[PDB]
Amino acid sequence: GMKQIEMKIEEILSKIYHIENEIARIKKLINLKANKADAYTKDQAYTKTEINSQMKQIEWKIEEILSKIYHIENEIARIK
Amino acid sequence: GMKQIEMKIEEILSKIYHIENEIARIKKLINLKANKADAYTKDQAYTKTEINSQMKQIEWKIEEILSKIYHIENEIARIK
Amino acid sequence: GMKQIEMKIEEILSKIYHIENEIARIKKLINLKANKADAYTKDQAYTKTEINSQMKQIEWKIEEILSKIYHIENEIARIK
């Protein structure tokens, strides 16, 4: 009965040691993860697609502007 | 005394089993978190507000440009 | 032999208690980390440098436009 208990104590001490190592590993894994406080949520930042869409809109207005300028330069050349 | 020790062994084995489970859960939770290496910090990316402010400044220059163009088109029409 | 086992049970219960506390701490650390689902990967967002580069390109086209407009206004003034 007493030798029995001893073998169970050994089993428990091994498991505890294995657990302590798992916990050490877990801590290191946690330190490689980004904190809420350092990362931007999706609400707080635009995606690449959203930015592309806004840049596109600007690009179209720039093209409209350039076509109008070219048309004006032409009108002026005809006046001269 | 020996039955006492036995009841404590049972308690310990239950706690250990419960701990092992907790650790299994924890690992899975960790895998749903973003790594520092894959996420952008706040100083590496602009917020929506910061982007809005920069887009606004561009828009004001566009409005100035378009007013000037419209005005020029009118000056030309009057010349013709 | 039996008092020996008792002192080992105490030693084990202390380790278990210490482990439980480590796990409690770990859980709280995990809740301060950003979830993949709430953060943007680097693939999904532009950096400040990337945005600056795109803004700069727009600003250069705006400068070119404003110089052309000024030049045009002057040509028109000379015609009148």
From Swiss-Prot, chains A, B, C:
Phenotype upon loss of function: Abolishes recruitment of the mediator complex to the upstream activating sequence (UAS) of amino-acid starvation responsive genes. Decreases RNA level of genes involved in amino acid biosynthesis and cofactor biosynthesis during amino acid starvation or methyl methanesulfonate stress. Growth dependent on amino acid supplementation. Sensitive to amino acid starvation. Sensitive to purine starvation. Decreases cellular glycogen levels during glucose starvation.
Signal peptide bounds: none
Post-translational modification: Phosphorylated by the cyclin-CDK PCL5-PHO85.
Domain (bZIP): residue spans on this chain: 2-80
Subcellular location: Nucleus
Inducing stimuli: Translation is induced by amino acid or purine starvation, or during growth in low or poor carbon sources. Translational repression during nutrient-rich conditions is dependent on four uORFs (upstream open reading frames) present in the 5'-UTR of the mRNA; these promote ribosome dissociation. Translational induction occurs in conditions reducing translation machinery efficiency, leading to ribosomes scanning over the uORFs, and increased translation of the mRNA. The rapid translational induction is followed by transcriptional induction at later time-points, independently of the uORF sequences.
Region (Leucine-zipper): 5-79
Record's comment describing the protein's domains: Residues 89 to 100 and 106 to 125 define the N-terminal activation domain (NTAD) and the central acidic activation domain (CAAD) respectively, which can function independently to promote high-level transcription of the target genes.
Family recorded in the similarity comment: Belongs to the bZIP family. GCN4 subfamily.
Function noted in UniProt: Master transcriptional regulator that mediates the response to amino acid starvation. Binds variations of the DNA sequence 5'-ATGA[CG]TCAT-3' in canonical nucleosome-depleted 5'-positioned promoters, and also within coding sequences and 3' non-coding regions. During nutrient starvation (low or poor amino acid, carbon or purine sources), it activates genes required for amino acid biosynthesis and transport, autophagy, cofactor biosynthesis and transport, mitochondrial transport, and additional downstream transcription factors.
Subunit structure: Homodimer. Each subunit binds overlapping and non-identical half-sites that flank the central CG base-pair in the pseudo-palindromic motif 5'-ATGA[CG]TCAT-3'. Interacts with the mediator tail; the interaction with GAL11/MED15 is direct. Interacts with the SAGA histone acetyltransferase complex. Interacts with the SWI/SNF chromatin remodeling complex.
Name this polypeptide is given: General control transcription factor GCN4
